Design a protein around this ligand. Sequence first.
Ligand code: NJB
Ligand code: ZN
Length: 208
Amino acid sequence: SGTILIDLSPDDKEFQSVEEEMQSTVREHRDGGHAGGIFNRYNILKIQKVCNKKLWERYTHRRKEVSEENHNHANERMLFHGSPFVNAIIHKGFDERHAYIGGMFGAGIYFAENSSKSNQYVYGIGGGTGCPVHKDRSCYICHRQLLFCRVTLGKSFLQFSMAHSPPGHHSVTGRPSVNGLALAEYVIYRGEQAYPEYLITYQIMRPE
Ligand SMILES: CCOc1ccc(-c2nnc([C@H]3C[C@H](NC(=O)c4ccnc5cccnc45)C3)n2-c2ccccc2Cl)nc1
Ligand SMILES: [Zn+2]
């Protein structure tokens, strides 16, 4: 596949940086933990840098094209990704051909600035049936994986809660609505506009 995983030590500043972004961007969700479970913190078990030459070159090549179409601005963001396909993504890269046709922003790949938002998608849309072992969306036992990804948004089209980016645009930024979203969500329609830089193995922590 070409993918090498570098285990980061908890004493490493790079580990701590991803760890803090994970913990600090947790919010309380309107569904009261229906989808992602009830927690205010994670047990961070492992952070691995994903190294894949081919996937990196695919990303930077697309990033250059987006920059030239957006006044030499990539609009590059570090965003969380949750889906049941994390292990496929780190080996083969993101693939829009597996995108769900029925989502709020159509057939795109979803990212979030809130780890707890991406956590809701780890076991499927709306948390699916929960963890494969206990069928529990609030499972404190089973180990989850998120990706912390380099994402090229370029010219992002602002929408409330579609097959490709709107004409002239490179992504969609979903925005909070009183009758729609609660938190910012970002959608790309081309897999090569994201690199899965960090693989985070964690549990949601049972609150005291
Ligand atoms: C109401 C909330 O709606 C949402 C939220 C998140 C996503 C989403 N965002 N990204 C995805 C996954 C990541 C994409 N898959 C791959 O990049 C991929 C890459 C390589 N191999 C694969 C093999 C099987 C499936 N996917 C792959 C599709 N998904 C996704 C797609 C289908 C099913 C479940 C999810 Cl989480 N879609 C809709
Ligand atoms: Zn479980």
